[PDB]
Amino acid sequence: SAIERITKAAHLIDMNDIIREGNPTLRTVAEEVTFPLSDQEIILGEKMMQFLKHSQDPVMAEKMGLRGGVGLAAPQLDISKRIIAVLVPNIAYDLEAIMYNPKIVSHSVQDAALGEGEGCLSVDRNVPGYVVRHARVTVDYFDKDGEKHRIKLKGYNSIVVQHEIDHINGIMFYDRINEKDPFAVKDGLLIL
């Protein structure tokens, strides 16, 4: 089982654990975790966070062959549970969270998109275009202890968490590009 294998003490997550488009797990809606969490579910969240930190560490990223990443969702490991990790570096970190059962509870009418577009660790190609998301979101999630957090995101951090939540709902970033005019800007779309 992917979770039993990845949560072994001796295993460091690397690109070989990340599934790519064509695997149906990326199109499946992931299952809610229950509380209390099992050790495996806690360890999985920790291992995903270690992957992100290793991926942003140039020494470790080089030794492990990693693509640097700011977010990861358990379905990208072939594990269909609603668990995500986000790590956004400050320009230590502007946002660092392991989220269980994350949910958007409120969002702005305004939309937003990264002006550079998006890629994905599960996507081995480039898909240009504005990926249209909500500009601001309020997100509820639980931590490893079962305590509820409610956070407000905007800017780049809002886009990142939205990308990962799309993963646990079976959605890919290019689902949000308008293929007819990928660079179209409707009224109410803020290009970041």
Ligand X SMILES: O=CN(O)C[C@@H](CC1CCCC1)C(=O)N1CCC[C@H]1C(=O)NC(=O)c1ccccc1
Strand order in the sheet with 133-134: 133-134, 111-113, 189-191
Nearer to ligand X by C-beta: 146 or 161?
161
* Residue 33 binds Ni ion (CB under 5 A): no
Sign of CA dihedral 108, 123, 181, 192: positive
Establish if 120 lies at the interface with Ni ion (CB under 5 A). yes
Amino acid of residue 115? G
The amino acid present at 7, given as its one-letter code, is T
Asked whether residue 163 is marked as a ligand-binding residue, the answer is yes
In the complex, least distance from residue 123 CB atom to Ni ion, rounded to whole angstroms: 7
Q: Which residue has the tokens 């942003």?
A: 56
Cis previous bond, 89, omega within 30: no
- Is 120 labelled as part of a ligand binding site? yes
Contact residues for ligand X, defined by CB under 6 A: 56, 67-73, 76, 89, 118-122, 159-160, 163-164, 167
Shortest distance, CB of residue 69 to ligand X, whole angstroms? 4
Q: Is 164 annotated in the active site?
A: yes
Q: Helix (H, G, I), strand (E, B), or coil: what is residue 172?
A: coil
Is the distance from CB of 106 to CB of 154 less than 8 angstroms? no
Window 152-191: residues binding Ni ion (CB under 5 A): none
Residue closer to Ni ion by CB (options 42, 72) is 72
**Nearest CB to ligand X, comparing residues 29 and 148:** 29
Q: From the candidates 21, 32, 46, 164, give the one annotated as an active-site residue.
A: 164
Residue 167 known to bind ligand = yes
CB-count burial class (<10 Å; 0-12, 13-18, 19+) for 180: exposed
In the complex, residue closest to Ni ion by CB? 120
Q: Which residue ranges make up the annotated binding site for Fe cation? A: 120, 163, 167
So which residues are the catalytic ones? 164
